[model samples]
Target: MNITSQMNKTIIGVSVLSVLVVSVVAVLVYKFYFH
Candidate 1:
C-alpha cells in the first residue's frame, strides 16, 4: 500500500522538523558542560 501525497508531505515535514529540534538540543547540551 502507498500513502497519499498529502500525507507523505506531512510525514516528511514532521520528520525534518523533529530532526532539526533534536540537533538543536544536542548542540545546546554539548555547549552547556562539555565545551
Candidate 2:
C-alpha cells in the first residue's frame, strides 16, 4: 500500500511535467510555423 501510494505521486508528477513540456513545444512549433 505504501509503495503504491508513492508510485501514484511519482506518476502524477511525471504526467504534469509531460503536459508542461508538450504545451511549450506546441507553442514554439506554432510560432515557428506561422510567423
Candidate 3:
C-alpha cells in the first residue's frame, strides 16, 4: 500500500465522522424507549 498523506487524513477523518454520526444516532435511540 502507498499510504499516501491525503489517504491517511481521510481515513482518520471518516473514522471520527463515522463515530460521531453513530453516537448521535445511539443517543436518540437510547432515549426513544425503555425496556
Compare candidates 2 and 3 on TM-score and give the better one: 2
Candidate 3 or 2, higher lDDT? 2
**TM-score of candidate 1 against the unseen true structure:** 0.70
lDDT for each residue of candidate 2 in 1-35, tens digit (9 for 90 to 100) = 46554456687999999999999999999999986
Instruction: Look at candidate 3 and tell me the lDDT of residue 28.
Output: 84
| Candidate 3 ranges beyond 4 A from true positions | 1-7
Clashes of each: 0, 0, 0
Q: What is the lDDT of residue 17 in candidate 2?
A: 99
For residue 22, what is the lDDT in candidate 2? 99
Q: How accurate is candidate 2 locally (lDDT)?
A: 0.87
lDDT of 3: 0.81
**Model 2, which residues run further than 4 Å from truth?**
1-7
* Residue-level error in angstroms, candidate 2, position 3: 18
Candidate 2 structure, TM-score to reference: 0.69
- The per-residue C-alpha lDDT of model 2 at residue 33 equals 98
Tell me the tens digit of each residue's lDDT in model 3 across 1-35.
66664556677888999999999888888888642
Better of 1 and 3 by lDDT: 1
**Which residue pairs collide in model 1, if any?**
none
